[PDB]
Structures are given as structure tokens and as C-alpha cells.
Amino acid sequence: SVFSMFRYSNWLDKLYMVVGTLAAIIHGAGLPLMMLVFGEMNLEEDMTRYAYYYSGIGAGVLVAAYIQVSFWCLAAGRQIHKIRKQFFHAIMRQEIGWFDVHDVGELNTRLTDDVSKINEGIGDKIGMFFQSMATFFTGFIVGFTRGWKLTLVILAISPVLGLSAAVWAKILSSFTDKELLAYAKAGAVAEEVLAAIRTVIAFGGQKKELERYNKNLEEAKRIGIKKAITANISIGAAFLLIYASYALAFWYGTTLVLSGEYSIGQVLTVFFSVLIGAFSVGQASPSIEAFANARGAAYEIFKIIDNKPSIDSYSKSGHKPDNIKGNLEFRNVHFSYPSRKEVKILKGLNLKVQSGQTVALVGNSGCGKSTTVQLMQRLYDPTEGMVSVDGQDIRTINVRFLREIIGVVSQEPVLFATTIAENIRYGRENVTMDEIEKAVKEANAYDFIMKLPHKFDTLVGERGAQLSGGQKQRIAIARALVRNPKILLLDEATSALDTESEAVVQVALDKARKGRTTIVIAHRLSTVRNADVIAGFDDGVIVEKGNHDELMKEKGIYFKLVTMQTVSFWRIMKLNLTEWPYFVVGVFCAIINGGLQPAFAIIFSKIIGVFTRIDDPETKRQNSNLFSLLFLALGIISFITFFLQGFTFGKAGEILTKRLRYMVFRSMLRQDVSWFDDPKNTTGALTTRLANDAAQVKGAIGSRLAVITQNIANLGTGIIISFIYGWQLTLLLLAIVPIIAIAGVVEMKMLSGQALKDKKELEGSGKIATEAIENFRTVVSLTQEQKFEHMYAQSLQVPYRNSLRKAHIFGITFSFTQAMMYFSYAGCFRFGAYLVAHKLMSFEDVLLVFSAVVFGAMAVGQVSSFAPDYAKAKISAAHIIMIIEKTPLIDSYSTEGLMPNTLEGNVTFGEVVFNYPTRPDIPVLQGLSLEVKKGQTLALVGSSGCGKSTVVQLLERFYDPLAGKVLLDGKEIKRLNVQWLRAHLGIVSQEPILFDCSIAENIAYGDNSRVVSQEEIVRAAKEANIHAFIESLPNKYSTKVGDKGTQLSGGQKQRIAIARALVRQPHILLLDEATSALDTESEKVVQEALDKAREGRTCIVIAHRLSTIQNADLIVVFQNGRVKEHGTHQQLLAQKGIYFSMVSV
């Protein structure tokens, strides 16, 4: 795209752009300007006039440097902020369909890490390039007078290399787009790895994920190596061509000296102007590289942005009528998911409801009830149907007004990482704490909210990870109530709610059911006992209908179901000791590179000396041709050396960066679950941290490091040529060097300080946005997108200003340093005039030293341009090094310990007292004791949030026990090798996590370190009562499951997880609420399958069905960390304990 990074000017941006361009023009063209005056060289009088001219040019140089840097960087910051804001606004704008079809996992790394370069390369370097252009131009103008004839020759080289830059730019643009796509894929893989890090650490599947990340990284490294070798070879060949054109012009001048067309002075001035143009191109060399990278990233970003979605999330066209009744109309609604447009989910179903009438939808698993609820939500438009509310077409009314006039409760709701206060406030724009308290009371959330510390300040973990399932469901119910809408959409609202809790919630909802057009769905007949209208589900059709009495008399699906129920400075380099010889070759190439920089002056002096040595013109021409040949040979060696140097730097840097990213992933996986629990160490937080750290580390360690080393060798050899030639003059130029070096320390310190905090704010924005994308479904449900955008805008407020400040600081520093160098050059000229009057040193030697310092001058300035990159890289490398250095409490990769191959299947917990890292103030464990023998299917029961999941997690060794001892067959869990057991046992989490992979792939994840057999997968799926449905599904087992299994109905996911656990065939199984939401027939099938393999594998069972726990060998009660009763199901049944009370309710 042309101006791909600009789509709005206004007076403001238009004037900013104009002024930046004009000021840079003065800068670039100003470079060959002071050069012309130098070439133009009573002798003392002219020396003073020229030195004063040099001082004036230097003062203007400071002025222009600051003006351009600052103004163009201010405009660039405005543009970058506008780009990010528009990107996020559109990202929210898109319809659900694009998110479903596309793998949103990339955006998290692409939203941040790329956006960085999108503006970075498209701003900082840009002014330079602009200025450089004028330079060449003015430099050519310099030669226009300096032997106009010879000047036309170089003119030919201008486009000869000009078109070359454009071509290399486009090629690198394609290469960078490919690299970015690969990087986005790697980031999506890492993000998905992070979010379910729990399960991944559970199954010990670390190796496979690590290999996947290394694979994406290797592909990216190959793409980068191609691009970087290309760019370095481009530099080398360009250098060779510049030297060749110079040699041709040298032969031309040799001819012209005898030709009499021009004097030697004019030709030398033309040669100086040509070398100035050479410096301009060398400056633009990297300026064209960033231009291209940014062009590719901007193409991609705006292409993602430009999409206008059909279900617009902001349009106000839709009507929002005042008088609305609780009447809905569904007719001939036939629709299918866009993840798989073939499968028909809606078979032309039709429904009806009335305000205050609660319509219950009960059917078979996968009936599409969640689909019906989402369709009501208008999240996706139906394929065919006239779904309308209160007569008016759903598409007719305003989308925002409708969505705000609706509430929904998800089957497995996800809680953002805030405090319950903020989560609830998300329910409505304006909520009174009186409303909050009323809602919490309605949802039974007051009990736990009060009991735990931070009553409303309790910051919930990611996705509500820090609270047990019951609490999350209560909080979600409270959120929905807080919405206080005219049409509620509770769906499977009771999943783990305690019988007392479930009854209380249902009674409260009914108490307020009068005004609400709710649509209840639930698997417990108690919840649908009072359902006003009960409808069955059968292949996308509704048959059984009417009152519960009507269905019971019909002996329909409802009747059958009812009956069935019955710091970093050099350590970063130190780590890269593997690249020792690539670095060595780079160093040798750069060494000669530097010497060459100021060596050009020695060549010019020798050329003049040959021209003025002998009067005879035959010998003169012979010597001139010999000099031209020597220059061409040196140019060939130089082209070779520069490309070898560039290749060495690029390859070593890419190797280092890939190694760093891979090792960081290895450690991040090797860290502890608690470290993930760390809010600062969040999922999106971890991903963005990794991406930005690696990106900055390379961006310093990349070709820029090579250019800085070359400038250091260049300016270095420059000052060196002065010492040999001049004495008592270059000493001044060098004694001043440290003065400018002092301004660099200040700049570096200030930039590092600014960057730490600005990057912290950027990472905060990244975690916020990552959560926004990952739970985009809930956000759509709550229509809280605008608040998300505002929070992101505020996040952007910090480093927007921070970068404005850093741009001002860098501009001032650069302008002051350049002007100081120009003042030093004018002063060296003045010292030379004084010395000439003293007549102690050769005037031509002074000319050579002045020219050599001018040659090193471009090098010095550009190295001045490495300050903020170097600081950012130091900071990023510090963070990465620290992250790698950590060795966790339980190290996954550390195999030291034992290995009880003779597993006796004997579990014993004694005085097990333990608390959560986020719930240390919340005593979760009190030292309860339990014992399980071989094939003992122990079941634990207790009140909501009785820590039940905590016993399972602790058995996971996810967290060691504050007090007590958990052994295994008479062996402490700590003593044995953790990996042996972690693979050995299997568990089924209460809200299981999938991976956006084939169902076959997910299941195969059930066992790792062993190739899964399609026969084994078939057997497990059959055992799970999901083989039939999966076969009914197209793509058999290769079906690509949505994000976190976002495409399979809840029973589907739970059955798949159970199959995964059974596949592991472990001696110890853990079923946390194993029938969270499944058909009673499905529950029976699962229980029968589990029983059929009961013997030989000890089991722990958790669920909220009396029948499910009835078969449990020994039931265990939970009472505030105390086991009140422990015995048979019949023992508790005979006893009038709380088990019996709950069973009754």
C-alpha cells in the first residue's frame, strides 16, 4: 500500500507532515552544503570565513535536527495511537463469524508486537531517509559545479542503484509479511498453550507443546535468515557498485586532467560530493529496510482492519422502541454454525413465549439449546427463519438496544481477571452498591463474598480461575440479575450449585420471574419441575410441548428422561558463546570496514599527489590508471567483506533470537502453576512479555548492531587517520569526543527509565486486550465492548505520552550532538588556520585530517542513533534473563527423585493443611485425613466451595501442602519423581479445557510420550458414549474443535475429556463433577463404563447427582475443611446427616 500508514491529515497532521518534510530537506541537503564550502577551499582570512560558515551550518544543523526529529515524531506518535485505537475499535466491530472462522489466537501477539514496528520503522528512520534524499540531491548539485561533466557520470549510477533499492524493498516487504505471519502463528500457539496451562501441566504434555513452538520458531528463523542475508547481500553489492562507478569516474577524471576540460580542484570537489552521496545512500540503506518492513506490517494490519462486518456492532440504524412486551416469535428457523456450514443445527424450528412465561427447553445433548440461546442473542443470523421479538423482526430493531435489553448466563461462564465488584459492575453501565448487594443476595453470593477477605476487593483469577465452580456460577447469576433485563436467558444455570443453593436460586428467580421472559435450560428435573412450557429436542425439531402434565401424559421424551433419572550489558552476549566464530568473522570484517571509512581521504590525497607528482602526461595517465585499478580492487575486497560481515551479523543474531525465544518458552513451561497464578504473570501477560522481550532483544542485536560496530570502526579509523596526519589538532577533536559521549549516558539513563514504565503500561494493555479477545463471546453477550475500548484507550494514554517524551528527548540529544560535532569541525578548521599562520604542519595534511573527521562524522552521528534501541534492548534482555534464570519449587524437567514402579494404589492424606497462593488468608485446608485402597472409588461431598477441587489439585502436586503429609502406597509424593506420577494418574477437571485441534488430536493428548492408536481412540470414544455422535459428525475425528473446544456442546467436551482420562488407563482417576452437563442417558452410560473398569484402578469421584454418588464405595463429607462423616453411601443415608438432608432437597 502507498501511504499505507496514513489515512487522515486534517490541518494538524498535514502541517506536521509538511514541516517535518521541509525541515528534513534542510538537514539532508544541508549535509552536502557544508561539504561544498569545505570543497571551495589572505589564506588565514579565507580560513576564518570558511570556519565561520561552518559554525553557522552547525547551528542550523542543531536547529533542524531537533525540529525534524521532534515534529515528525509527534506526528508519528499521533498516527501510531490512532492506528492502535482504530485497530482495536474495528477488532471489536467485526461480527462473531469472523472471530469463529479465523484463529483469533494470532491477534494477541499481532495486536501488540507488530503494531510496534508498524509505527517504529514507519517513523524513527523515516525522517533520516527523507533528509538523506536531499543530501544526495544537494551532493549532486555540489558536483553540478564541481566538474559538471564528471557529475553526469555519477548521475547515471543514481538510478542504476535507485531502482535496486526499490526492488530490494519490495522483496523484503514480502519476506517480512511471511515472517510476521509465522510469528503470529507461533504467538497463537503460545497463547493457547498458556490459557490451558493447567491441563497441559496436568498431562505432562510439555514435550509436544515445546516441539510445536520450536517448529514454528524454526520456520520463522528460516524466513528471517532469508530476509537478512538478502539485505546484507544488497548492502554488499550496492557498495561494490558504488566503488565501481567511482572508479569509472576516476578514469574519466584522469582523461579530463590532460583534456583541460576541468582543473583538478573541480574534479576533487566532484569526488567529495560523490562520497557525500555515498554517505547519504549508506544512511538510507537501513532507512529503506524499515520502510519495507513497515509497509508489509501496515498492509497486513489495515487489511485486517478494513473489513466491514455485516452485523455491525456500532450502527444506530436499528430501531429501539419504547413499549416492548415479553413476546418472542421463532418460525422456520433453520440455521447452521459457520464453523461447519454443512451440519444443520436448526431444522426450521419454531417457538413462542410470553412476558413472564418461563419457557424451558430440555432435550438431548447437542440438541442445540445453547445454539437456540445464541440465536435468540442474534450473535449469528439464522440461515433461514423469521425469528422476531414482540412482532418486530429481530433484524429490524437496533442491535445495541436489543442486546442491552437482554441478559444471558453461559453454561460455563468465564470471569475476567478483576474483583467481583468490577465483574458485577460490568453487568450494567450504572449500578448502585444497593443493587449489587440485592443481586448478590438473590444469587446466594453474599455468604462467600462476606466470609472471604477482600469482600468485594477479592480479585478473581483469570477466567475466574481463583474461585471454585459454584462461586463462579453464583457470580454469573448475580451479573445476569444486575443486568435487570426484560428477557433473561438462563441456560444450564445450575451446573455445580449445591442442592440448597440450587433451590434457593430457583426460588429467587421464580419470585422475580413474573416480569421476566426467561428461557430456562437445566439437566436437573428439580430445576424444570415448575417450568411453564417444556419442549423436547429431537434432531433440530420440537415435538413434546405444553405443560409438564401434558408431556407426562404424552409419555414423551420428557417422561422418558424423568423416568430414567428416577542487568544485561554483556551477559546477553556471554550466553551466545555458540556463535563464537560468526561473531569473529563479523569482527574481522567490521575492523577493515572502519579503516576504510576515513581511508577514502588518504586515497584522495594520494590521487592529488599523483596528479601533481610528474609533469609528463603519459606517466601521469599511467599512474592514474594504476590508481583507479587499485581503487577498484580495494572496492571488490570491500564489497566481499561488507557482505560477509552483514551475513555474519544477521545469521548470528537470528540464531540467538530463536534460541532465546525457545529457551524462554522452555522455562515458562518449567515454571510453577503458582507463578502463573501471579496476576502480573498472566496468560496474555506472559505471551506479550515473551513477544516484546524477544522483539526488542533482536531489534538491538540485529543489523543495527552491525551498523553501530561499523560506525565505531569507521569514526574510530577516522580519528586514527587524524593522529597520524595531524598532531595538536585532532587531539582537540578527540578530547571533545567524551563531552558528547557524556550527553549519551544521560540519554541512555533517561530512555531506560522511560521505557521500563512505558513497556509495563503496554504489557498491561496487551493483557487487557488478550482477555478481551479470548472471552470475546462473553463480551458480546454483555455488549461491554465500548467499556473495553475505553479501558484500552486509558491504557494507551500512558505510553503515548511516554513516547512523545522520549521522542522529544532523543530529538534534542541528536540535534545537540550533531551540532556539537559541527562546532568541533569548524573549530578544527580554526585551529588549522592558526597553525598555518604558525606554519608548523602541512596545509594539505590538515585538509586530509578535516576530510577524515568528516568521513567519520556520519558514522558518529548514526551511532548516536542507537541510544534508545540499546536501552530498550538492555531492559528487555534483563527481563528475559531473569525469567529464564528462575528454577521453580517443583521443576517439571528435573527428573531427580525416585520411581515406585510397584504402585500399590494406596493413597493416604494426613493432617493435610494447605491454602492457595491467592487464598492464603482464606484457609482452604485444615488438615483433613483420608485413605484409599486399590480400586477404591472414593467420593467426596460437601458444601459449595468445600475445597473439593483442592484435594484433587493437591493430589496433582500443583501446590505442596502447608501442613500434613500426602503419601502414595506408603511413599511421600514429594520423594518420588513427579513426572512418573503426573503421567501415571489421570483426572477430569470440573470445567475441562480443549485445544483448537482435531478431536483425535485432543484425545491423543490424553496420553503423551506414546503414540495414540486410532483403535484406542475408538474404544475410548465408545466408552464415553460419544463415538456415535462423533461418527454422526463429519470429518469423523479430524473435526477441528473450536477454540478451547468452543464448537462442541458441553456434554461433548466433558465426554471427550473423560475419554482422554480413560485412554491414559491410570491406576488413579479423578472425576471432578464428571457429569457437569450431560443427558441422563449419557450420565448412565458414563457411569456404567466407569464401573466396568472399576477394579484395578483407584478412583475419586465428584458430582452433584445422588445416584452418581450412591454407587461410591465410601462417601466423604466436607465441612469447612473437616470431614464430618466418612463411610458408605448406605451408612450416610441411614444417618440423618447433611448428606440425607441434601438428598431430600
Ligand SMILES: Nc1ncnc2c1ncn2[C@@H]1O[C@H](COP(=O)(O)OP(=O)(O)OP(=O)(O)O)[C@@H](O)[C@H]1O
Ligand atoms: N460454535 C460452534 N460451531 C460449530 N458447531 C457448534 C458450535 N457450538 C456447538 N456446535 C455444535 O452444535 C451442537 C449443538 O449446539 P449447542 O451446543 O448449542 O447445543 P446444546 O443443546 O446447548 O448442547 P449441550 O446440551 O450438549 O451442551 C453441539 O453439540 C456441537 O455439535
Ligand SMILES: Nc1ncnc2c1ncn2[C@@H]1O[C@H](COP(=O)(O)OP(=O)(O)OP(=O)(O)O)[C@@H](O)[C@H]1O
Ligand atoms: N486458584 C485458586 N486460588 C485461590 N483460592 C482458590 C483457588 N481455587 C479455589 N480457591 C478457593 O478454594 C475454594 C474451593 O474451591 P475448589 O474448586 O478447590 O473446591 P470445590 O468446593 O469442590 O469447588 P465448587 O465450588 O465447584 O464446589 C474456592 O471456593 C476458593 O475460595
Ligand SMILES: [Mg+2]
Ligand atoms: Mg449447552
Ligand SMILES: [Mg+2]
Ligand atoms: Mg469443584
